[PDB]
């Protein structure tokens, strides 16, 4: 299940999954923590800019979220996690299998409610500790005491009492003493929501049947009751800006505001959140402001404020209706198609079954926006034909993007389900285009493709016809007919000379776009499902119905690579930017990476949810995938982009059960020496020899206007081998080389100089690093030329020189070889 190439990064587009969000205050500002599946995200109320994300994903889905100053407390399954800045600081593990349901924290006490009507109390080890860790005691409420726990609430000024709220009634427990101090009277209707009022000794209770009760706990008696016939309360919140205003959220998606002092309805916000997804899951006033936060299960968080009254007097009577301040949101259903907007990784294009197309920015969430579907006014001047009731365009089966012509006109095509024409979009305008493209053959659109220049749009009909238009004017230019079944893929190379088509009939058509001629036709064994064309390499892969990926080279129109191993239909696949790897997803809930050079699967993954789409970044850093479940986008990091990856084929049997090294890493190192007889230079920069020969003139200009070496030399002299001295000679810096050569003894019997000649003579025999060896001996004549010449007749000096000349005489073939190559090179280029 773990990839050696990829690793999850984060989720994009999901702001809330429906769990009630928690509000915490640091100083003046306020921050909101929202649940996203197994992770939580923190947004700044000032800008709704994300501030932190959970460092790791929780093992189980989070059920309750509570935040208090810097710390955020998260409850999942039978464990409660404590996080700071998104970093877990401590984990509170409960001793019972019963899963936590509600979480309440007040002062030094942490209270957790499990599904078995058991309340666990934790306390701080130290009064000055930052969070509670120690287990104080366990309090369990029995059926006789009350019903199932609705929520855990603590009201101000109550010296270690927890105001436990149940469906049957409310109960008061002293956590310090672990005793039931008071039991509230039974209520006819089940309680659903509890919220402590800003007043002392009153808590607002919401029922199933539209009843809000401001039960005074101190008096143990009802004070007031608000009626909401035919509604179900979901959230309550009081306004702390000095106005006695109460907000009641409903599962219908409706938010109502009451004036407690005036006993009147200020205003109602209708359908702010979808009723299908739970309506208003949570709605809370910001402490001490006229602003209210709202959230729902529709993957949306909205932000409303109450403006000042327009009347100089009696402002309480003249209350402005709340006005939309800001919001963040995403798709309400899992995305159906995804695309990379630009050569960079800045903006994504996503479509979902909620009939929505969104622009999501990996770089920053705030940059994410939804493209508009307001239609431009037609050029002709007639009325548009459509329903008066505005309805959102059908789901986008396919989409194509280009940026060669961004900002000049429409750069996008999309295809809709059960629909006979293609709509355009302009990424720069983030709005629908003014051109609509029809198949003209009474067929549904099945394939949409772009030319690289961005001047041609290609539409694949279900009836086998291809229509080619121009984007700037939206006018038909050419219309081709080969396939008699639906065409499932159209691709035109970066040139626009050759276009390739594929259809369910199983044939692949090769055309000349310029001359409009059928270059060739290729028939495959099984029907085609999809195509991806790699323009840089001119290789394109096809998803066959036989559970195979067939790669074809358009230049020669031959099947070049065929991939096997998928146990079910291939949902999606993509080419790597370098065109070397292909990653495919299939209904068998596995992601496979295929290495085209060897034509084998190198990495395999098992996804819990089938990945509907897979798309590489043009940079190749990231891989984006969409699954059958989840409204967000899974982003992966390409580990290959930081280190090499072994290309060994993956074990099929091991993968099924879960459900030459230089070649393996695509590298090679040149040999130190191909052959002993062959002359080979040193392994280093070629400027060294110039530096060694001309050090003094280099050194002159630069002005402003026993030793180990000798020990090795004598050691080699007795051993008759100077390799150890030879190896170190290569290693010295040029300055060090000069000093050792100069420092060589120059007095009779001249023993040192003889061995150095012998040492260099041995190195010259090796035929490796020979050009260095010529350089040192050149320095010898420079430093000891007078010495050697003066005593040339000495047998020891003469014999050593004669031996080297014997070797050096052999190394004259290089002169013939180099000096030849210029004669032919000069001639062949010249005549």
């Amino acid at each position: 299940k773990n990839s050696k190439i990829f690793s999850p990064f984060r989720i994009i587009g999901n702001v809330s999954n429906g769990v009630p969000f928690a509000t915490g205050t640091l100083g003046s500002t306020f921050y909101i923590v929202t649940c996203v599946g197994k992770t939580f995200q923190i947004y700044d109320a000032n800008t709704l800019h994300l501030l932190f994300v959970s460092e790791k994903e929780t093992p189980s889905s989070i059920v309750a979220l509570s935040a208090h100053f810097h710390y955020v407390y998260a409850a999942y399954e039978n464990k409660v996690g404590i996080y700071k800045r998104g970093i877990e600081e401590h984990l509170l593990e409960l001793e019972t299998d019963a899963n936590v349901e509600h979480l309440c924290i007040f002062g030094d006490y942490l209270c957790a409610s499990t599904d078995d009507n058991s309340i666990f109390i934790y306390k701080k080890s130290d009064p000055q500790d930052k969070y509670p860790s120690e287990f104080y005691t366990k309090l369990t409420v029995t059926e006789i005491q009350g019903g199932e726990i609705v929520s855990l609430q603590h009201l101000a000024t109550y010296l270690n009492k927890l105001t436990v709220v149940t469906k049957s009634n409310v109960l008061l427990f002293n956590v310090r003493t672990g005793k039931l101090v008071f039991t509230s009277n039974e209520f006819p209707d089940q309680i659903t929501t509890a919220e402590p009022a800003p007043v002392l000794d009153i808590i607002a209770l919401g029922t199933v049947t539209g009843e809000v009760i401001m039960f005074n706990m101190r008096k143990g008696k009802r004070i007031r009751t608000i009626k909401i016939p035919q509604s179900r309360i979901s959230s309550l919140s009081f306004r702390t800006d000095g106005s006695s205003h109460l907000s009641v959220g409903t599962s219908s998606g409706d938010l109502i505001f009451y004036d407690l002092d005036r006993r009147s309805r200020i205003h109602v916000l209708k359908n702010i959140h979808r009723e299908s997804y739970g309506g208003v899951t949570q709605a809370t006033f910001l402490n001490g402001q006229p602003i209210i936060v709202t959230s729902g299960g529709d993957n949306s968080l909205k932000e409303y404020v109450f403006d000042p009254s327009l009347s100089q007097g009696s402002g309480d009577v003249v209350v402005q209706p709340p006005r939309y301040l800001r919001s963040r949101g995403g798709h309400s259903q899992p995305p159906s198609y995804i695309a990379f907007a630009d050569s960079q990784s800045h903006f994504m294009l996503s479509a979902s079954k909620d009939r929505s197309l969104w622009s999501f920015s990996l770089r920053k969430d705030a940059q994410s926006q939804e493209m508009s579907q307001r239609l431009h006014k037609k050029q002709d001047g007639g009325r548009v034909g459509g329903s008066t009731i505005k309805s959102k365009f059908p789901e986008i089966v396919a989409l194509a993007i280009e940026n060669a012509r961004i900002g000049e006109w429409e750069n996008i095509i999309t295809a809709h389900k059960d629909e006979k024409f293609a709509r355009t979009w302009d990424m720069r305008n983030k709005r629908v285009g003014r051109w609509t493209f029809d198949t003209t053959d009474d067929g549904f659109v099945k394939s949409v493709a772009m030319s690289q220049c961005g001047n041609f749009g290609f539409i694949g009909s279900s009836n086998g016809s291809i229509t080619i238009y121009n984007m700037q004017s939206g006018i038909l230019r050419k219309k081709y007919k080969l396939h008699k079944r639906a065409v499932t893929g159209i691709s035109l190379d970066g040139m626009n000379r050759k276009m390739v088509s594929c259809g369910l009939d199983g044939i692949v058509g090769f055309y000349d776009f310029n001359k409009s001629t059928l270059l060739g036709k290729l028939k495959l064994d099984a029907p085609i499902t999809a195509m991806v064309y790699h323009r840089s390499s001119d290789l394109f892969a096809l998803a066959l119905d036989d559970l195979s990926i067939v790669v074809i080279d358009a230049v020669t129109q031959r099947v070049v690579r065929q991939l096997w191993g998928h146990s079910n239909r291939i949902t999606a696949f993509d080419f790597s930017p370098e065109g070397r790897w292909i990653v495919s997803a299939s209904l068998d809930s596995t992601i496979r990476t295929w290495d085209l050079p060897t034509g084998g699967c190198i990495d395999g993954i098992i996804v819990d949810n089938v990945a509907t789409n897979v798309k590489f970044s043009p940079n190749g850093d990231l891989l984006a995938t969409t699954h059958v479940t989840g409204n967000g986008i899974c982003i992966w990091t390409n580990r290959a982009q930081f280190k090499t990856v072994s290309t060994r084929t993956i074990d099929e049997s091991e993968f099924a059960r879960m459900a030459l090294n230089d070649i393996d890493f695509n590298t090679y190192t040149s040999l130190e020496q191909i052959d002993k007889e062959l002359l080979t230079l040193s392994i280093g920069p070629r400027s060294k020899m110039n530096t060694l020969l001309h050090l003094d003139v280099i050194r002159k200009r630069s002005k402003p206007k026993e030793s180990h070496f000798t020990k090795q030399l004598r050691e080699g002299s007795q051993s008759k081998d100077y390799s150890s001295l030879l190896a170190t000679l290569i290693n010295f810096s040029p300055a060090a080389v000069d000093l050792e050569i100069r420092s060589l003894n120059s007095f009779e019997p001249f023993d040192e100089i003889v061995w150095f000649i012998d040492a260099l003579t041995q190195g010259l025999k090796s035929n490796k690093n020979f050009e260095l060896y010529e350089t040192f001996m050149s320095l010898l004549f420079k430093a000891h030329g007078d010495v050697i010449h003066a005593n040339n007749k000495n047998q020891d000096i003469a014999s050593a020189l004669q031996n080297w000349e014997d070797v050096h005489k052999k190394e004259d073939r290089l002169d013939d070889l180099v000096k030849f190559c210029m004669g032919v090179a000069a001639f062949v280029t010249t005549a």
Partner: protein, 206 residues
């Protein structure tokens, strides 16, 4: 397989004769002769008997005296038209030349069903003197291909003209006869006789 670039019938508010549409299908000299099948039989005359660029009418107003070898790129029919007009009275009158040539191709097609342009090419290729003489006595010397084509056009035009200078036969028919005979290679064409005499004389001075 089929490709459709035209999804509506075309009717222009100004009427157009249908032969003009047939011309739109293919460019033909006077909308009546095709260049596609025309080839220069002799390799030497290739690259200097230019027939690959089709033209409706011989008139082009091209710049064909600017450089040395520009005359090669000229359409050969236009070269024949230019050579036809001569002798002062016909000077300046290219339109009369075009009309005369059009009559000549009509006559050639009538007499021989073969494409007249190929007849023109065959005559020019046949009549090109391959070897000549230069005064030193005389000495034999080779002949450059542009000199061949120029001299060929000259002989054909001159022979056709002189044959009809004071005779009932008009310029068009004497042309058509001379080009037909030159294409055949028969000695009847004046130009072939001159070419034979020139090459033979060079052979004597070889």
């Amino acid at each position: 397989f089929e490709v459709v670039e035209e999804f509506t019938p075309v009717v222009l508010a100004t009427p157009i004769p249908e032969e003009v549409q047939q011309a739109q299908t293919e460019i033909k000299l006077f909308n009546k002769w095709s260049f596609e099948e025309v080839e220069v039989k002799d390799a030497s005359l290739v690259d200097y008997v230019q027939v690959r660029q089709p033209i409706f009418v011989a008139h082009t107003a091209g710049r064909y005296a600017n450089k040395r070898f520009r005359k090669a790129q000229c359409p050969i029919i236009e070269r024949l038209t230019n050579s036809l007009m001569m002798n002062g009275r016909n000077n300046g009158k290219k339109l009369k030349a075009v009309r005369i040539i059009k009559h000549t191709l009509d006559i050639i097609n009538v007499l021989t069903d073969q494409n007249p342009i190929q007849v023109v090419v065959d005559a020019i290729t046949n009549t090109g003197p391959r070897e000549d003489t230069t005064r030193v006595r005389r000495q034999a010397v080779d002949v450059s291909p542009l000199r061949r084509v120029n001299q060929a056009i000259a002989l054909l035009t001159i022979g056709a003209r002189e044959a009809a200078f004071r005779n009932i036969k008009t310029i068009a028919e004497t042309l058509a006869e001379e080009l037909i005979n030159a294409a055949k290679g028969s000695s009847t064409s004046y130009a072939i006789k001159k070419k034979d005499e020139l090459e033979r004389v060079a052979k004597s001075n070889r």
